[PDB]
Write an enzyme that holds these catalytic residues in place. Structure first.
Site, PDB file in Angstrom:
ATOM      1  N   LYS A   3      45.523  41.445  45.589  1.00  0.00           N
ATOM      2  CA  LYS A   3      45.969  41.629  44.215  1.00  0.00           C
ATOM      3  C   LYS A   3      47.484  41.856  44.147  1.00  0.00           C
ATOM      4  O   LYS A   3      47.993  42.836  43.585  1.00  0.00           O
ATOM      5  CB  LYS A   3      45.208  42.774  43.518  1.00  0.00           C
ATOM      6  CG  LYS A   3      43.703  42.568  43.524  1.00  0.00           C
ATOM      7  CD  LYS A   3      43.003  43.524  42.558  1.00  0.00           C
ATOM      8  CE  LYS A   3      41.535  43.139  42.344  1.00  0.00           C
ATOM      9  NZ  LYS A   3      40.923  44.020  41.356  1.00  0.00           N
ATOM     10  N   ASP A  17      41.681  40.242  49.262  1.00  0.00           N
ATOM     11  CA  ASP A  17      41.718  40.677  47.844  1.00  0.00           C
ATOM     12  C   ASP A  17      42.867  41.676  47.669  1.00  0.00           C
ATOM     13  O   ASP A  17      42.642  42.828  47.282  1.00  0.00           O
ATOM     14  CB  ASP A  17      40.351  41.255  47.489  1.00  0.00           C
ATOM     15  CG  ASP A  17      40.104  41.588  46.032  1.00  0.00           C
ATOM     16  OD1 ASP A  17      40.891  41.196  45.165  1.00  0.00           O
ATOM     17  OD2 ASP A  17      39.077  42.240  45.775  1.00  0.00           O
ATOM     18  N   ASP A  46      53.699  42.332  42.147  1.00  0.00           N
ATOM     19  CA  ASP A  46      55.099  42.792  42.171  1.00  0.00           C
ATOM     20  C   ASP A  46      55.989  41.601  41.837  1.00  0.00           C
ATOM     21  O   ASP A  46      55.495  40.497  41.569  1.00  0.00           O
ATOM     22  CB  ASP A  46      55.395  43.437  43.527  1.00  0.00           C
ATOM     23  CG  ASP A  46      56.434  44.548  43.503  1.00  0.00           C
ATOM     24  OD1 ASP A  46      57.481  44.405  42.801  1.00  0.00           O
ATOM     25  OD2 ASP A  46      56.220  45.556  44.217  1.00  0.00           O
ATOM     26  N   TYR A  57      28.360  46.105  36.217  1.00  0.00           N
ATOM     27  CA  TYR A  57      27.621  45.009  36.878  1.00  0.00           C
ATOM     28  C   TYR A  57      26.948  44.095  35.860  1.00  0.00           C
ATOM     29  O   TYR A  57      26.430  44.533  34.824  1.00  0.00           O
ATOM     30  CB  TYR A  57      26.619  45.551  37.895  1.00  0.00           C
ATOM     31  CG  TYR A  57      27.291  46.224  39.057  1.00  0.00           C
ATOM     32  CD1 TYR A  57      28.135  45.513  39.893  1.00  0.00           C
ATOM     33  CD2 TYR A  57      27.128  47.572  39.301  1.00  0.00           C
ATOM     34  CE1 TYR A  57      28.767  46.113  40.964  1.00  0.00           C
ATOM     35  CE2 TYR A  57      27.777  48.187  40.356  1.00  0.00           C
ATOM     36  CZ  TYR A  57      28.608  47.461  41.185  1.00  0.00           C
ATOM     37  OH  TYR A  57      29.231  48.069  42.232  1.00  0.00           O
ATOM     38  N   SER A  70      31.729  40.719  49.698  1.00  0.00           N
ATOM     39  CA  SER A  70      32.835  41.691  49.639  1.00  0.00           C
ATOM     40  C   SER A  70      32.630  42.700  50.766  1.00  0.00           C
ATOM     41  O   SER A  70      31.820  43.631  50.604  1.00  0.00           O
ATOM     42  CB  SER A  70      32.906  42.319  48.287  1.00  0.00           C
ATOM     43  OG  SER A  70      34.082  43.096  48.170  1.00  0.00           O
TER      44      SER A  70
HETATM   45  O1  LIG Z   1      57.730  49.476  40.791  1.00  0.00           O
HETATM   46  C1  LIG Z   1      58.849  48.979  41.078  1.00  0.00           C
HETATM   47  O2  LIG Z   1      59.751  49.708  41.550  1.00  0.00           O
HETATM   48  C2  LIG Z   1      59.241  47.644  40.494  1.00  0.00           C
HETATM   49  C3  LIG Z   1      58.845  47.353  39.194  1.00  0.00           C
HETATM   50  C4  LIG Z   1      59.472  46.336  38.484  1.00  0.00           C
HETATM   51  O3  LIG Z   1      59.273  46.233  37.243  1.00  0.00           O
HETATM   52  N1  LIG Z   1      60.455  45.612  39.061  1.00  0.00           N
HETATM   53  C5  LIG Z   1      60.839  45.823  40.333  1.00  0.00           C
HETATM   54  O4  LIG Z   1      61.838  45.215  40.773  1.00  0.00           O
HETATM   55  N2  LIG Z   1      60.210  46.811  41.114  1.00  0.00           N
HETATM   56  C6  LIG Z   1      60.580  47.053  42.523  1.00  0.00           C
HETATM   57  O5  LIG Z   1      61.886  47.642  42.582  1.00  0.00           O
HETATM   58  C7  LIG Z   1      62.703  46.923  43.515  1.00  0.00           C
HETATM   59  C8  LIG Z   1      63.770  46.082  42.822  1.00  0.00           C
HETATM   60  O6  LIG Z   1      64.633  45.704  43.887  1.00  0.00           O
HETATM   61  P1  LIG Z   1      66.057  44.996  43.621  1.00  0.00           P
HETATM   62  O7  LIG Z   1      65.929  43.784  42.704  1.00  0.00           O
HETATM   63  O8  LIG Z   1      66.552  44.634  45.002  1.00  0.00           O
HETATM   64  O9  LIG Z   1      67.010  46.044  43.086  1.00  0.00           O
HETATM   65  C9  LIG Z   1      61.774  46.041  44.334  1.00  0.00           C
HETATM   66  O10 LIG Z   1      61.318  46.701  45.528  1.00  0.00           O
HETATM   67  C10 LIG Z   1      60.601  45.808  43.415  1.00  0.00           C
HETATM   68  O11 LIG Z   1      59.419  45.660  44.212  1.00  0.00           O
HETATM   69  O1  LIG Z   2      37.703  42.411  38.655  1.00  0.00           O
HETATM   70  C1  LIG Z   2      37.541  42.704  39.842  1.00  0.00           C
HETATM   71  C2  LIG Z   2      38.310  42.210  40.943  1.00  0.00           C
HETATM   72  C3  LIG Z   2      38.000  42.582  42.193  1.00  0.00           C
HETATM   73  N1  LIG Z   2      36.956  43.446  42.479  1.00  0.00           N
HETATM   74  C4  LIG Z   2      36.628  43.777  43.881  1.00  0.00           C
HETATM   75  O2  LIG Z   2      35.349  43.232  44.173  1.00  0.00           O
HETATM   76  C5  LIG Z   2      34.553  44.200  44.911  1.00  0.00           C
HETATM   77  C6  LIG Z   2      33.411  44.699  44.059  1.00  0.00           C
HETATM   78  O3  LIG Z   2      32.549  45.438  44.925  1.00  0.00           O
HETATM   79  P1  LIG Z   2      31.136  46.014  44.458  1.00  0.00           P
HETATM   80  O4  LIG Z   2      30.193  44.852  44.352  1.00  0.00           O
HETATM   81  O5  LIG Z   2      30.802  46.966  45.562  1.00  0.00           O
HETATM   82  O6  LIG Z   2      31.332  46.725  43.146  1.00  0.00           O
HETATM   83  C7  LIG Z   2      35.523  45.291  45.337  1.00  0.00           C
HETATM   84  O7  LIG Z   2      36.087  45.034  46.616  1.00  0.00           O
HETATM   85  C8  LIG Z   2      36.595  45.259  44.254  1.00  0.00           C
HETATM   86  O8  LIG Z   2      37.836  45.701  44.770  1.00  0.00           O
HETATM   87  C9  LIG Z   2      36.151  43.939  41.463  1.00  0.00           C
HETATM   88  O9  LIG Z   2      35.202  44.673  41.662  1.00  0.00           O
HETATM   89  N2  LIG Z   2      36.509  43.549  40.195  1.00  0.00           N
END
Ligand SMILES: O=C(O)c1cc(=O)[nH]c(=O)n1[C@@H]1O[C@H](COP(=O)(O)O)[C@@H](O)[C@H]1O
Ligand SMILES: O=c1ccn([C@@H]2O[C@H](COP(=O)(O)O)[C@@H](O)[C@H]2O)c(=O)[nH]1
Lengths: 256, 256
Positions: B91, B89, B94, B209, B34
């Protein structure tokens, strides 16, 4: 039930929530534009033209092809001029130690320009603790994602209750929710609802739409978040005005 | 139970999983570094020195103060030279329509350089469908976050089961999991486990950990993800070798 202007004065109100609620009342808008564009010039032209119609402009900085911090300086100028908040929809969702760096640092320096960010609650409260260690000193606010608009969302039942508890335990930084409905009974918290269009439908990748009248009037949310319903329209100013009037009247009719 | 080298040949194996499993077997490493640093020069110096010891280098591109696509080109040169995959990473978490843009576009162009990315399952399967529209044509793979290392994680019980179902229904693109343990009984899927250090403890923001012997040997995971246990050590090469030998022997002893 209190007006936005009265909620802005509640004892436990966060300063960012107060600023937002005051400009919502002043401008008669509870519309958040989802500025889902890839060009800085289109982002800024939308912000300038629609600024008077919106309480908030929601960004995805990571889909801008020509992001620079100078673009965000220009967006802040427009936010100050027209009076709206900037919300970066980053959906922080990592361990606390990582999200603090993702919020403050890298290319985007999100905390330097975003009034609001949001976070998923799935990692546990460390995600909020990490963000708040950057955001509290920078006088920022955060929204927790309690419910999601997309098909198959797992943000239901006990998950939604956990998001509300986490918000109500971090009220120095968390100012409200992304939700489909009122999820907190505490009027200090904002409810922002995406998945909004005037017409029934969805998209091809799990988005589901409900109307402003449904989400503000029947489901009790505060703010509609609207992307394609505005952005894909020919006249984005008239579309913004139609969404603003819909959300505002739905709010007024719940107040009585 | 099959060796990494035999799993690389399974009928339903994804090409990215196969490539990874083959280099794990060849190099006797199931360690993912990481690379949680803010400087490109430190990222590249770690990738070069530790490349022989690792099967994978995990990035957070959004914390790199001096990110450019040229930095990513130099990282790919090292990944090809030393034989390791690059895992961003990010994640993704959306709606499908948004994550497709976040994966392909913006300033990071993650899909252009990342062999692997990961996604949260909380938005429903649209998150995978959006990513896979970019990732399938670019021959990429995805990991789903089935369990998290952080205190208060809500990725338990039915949530973990939903992540496994979503992976097993999108096997053309999903190659495994972020998890604390073996969560799928299908050997085609990779299990990668963060929250790993040789010593007991945690951090001040909810990280917890467990040891390589615990997560590879007792909990049946495939790969350890290690950040600070290596990065904060004075000699990062010797630290990487300690973690590699720990994870590799735990794997061998589970095989017999
Ligand atoms: O956090 C957000 O705004 C989000 C949450 C969610 O539950 N659903 C969701 O659509 N969004 C965001 O809100 C916008 C929805 O866009 P439209 O479908 O074009 O109206 C997008 O940019 C999504 O990324
Ligand atoms: O469940 C998860 C998923 C990702 N990660 C990522 O893995 C890395 C963990 O780093 P660390 O060993 O320094 O704690 C760090 O980049 C986090 O963003 C977690 O630590 N836990």
């Amino acid at each position: 039930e209190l007006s936005f202007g009265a909620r802005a004065e509640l004892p436990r109100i966060h300063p960012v929530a107060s600023k937002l609620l005051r400009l919502m009342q002043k401008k008669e808008t509870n519309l958040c534009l989802s500025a889902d564009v890839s060009l800085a010039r289109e982002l800024l032209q939308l912000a300038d033209a629609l600024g008077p119609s919106i309480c908030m402009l929601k960004t995805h900085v990571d889909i801008l092809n020509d992001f620079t911090l100078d673009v965000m300086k220009e967006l802040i100028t427009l936010a100050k001029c027209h009076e709206f908040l900037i919300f970066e929809d980053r959906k922080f969702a990592d361990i606390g130690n990582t999200v603090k760096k993702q919020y403050e640092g890298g290319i985007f320096k999100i905390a330097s320009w975003a009034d609001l960010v949001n976070a998923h609650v799935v990692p546990g409260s460390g995600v909020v603790k990490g963000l708040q260690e950057v955001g509290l000193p920078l006088h920022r606010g955060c929204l927790l994602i309690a419910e999601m608009s997309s098909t198959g969302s797992l943000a239901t039942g006990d998950y939604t209750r956990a998001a509300v508890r986490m918000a109500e335990e971090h009220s120095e930084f968390v100012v409200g929710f992304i939700s489909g409905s009122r999820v907190s009974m505490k009027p200090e918290f904002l409810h922002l609802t995406p998945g909004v269009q005037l017409e029934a439908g969805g998209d091809n990748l799990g988005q589901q739409y409900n109307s402003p009248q449904e989400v503000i009037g029947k489901r009790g949310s505060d703010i509609i978040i609207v992307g394609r319903g505005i952005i894909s329209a020919a006249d984005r100013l008239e579309a913004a005005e139609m969404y603003r009037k819909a959300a505002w009247e739905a709010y007024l009719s719940r107040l009585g």
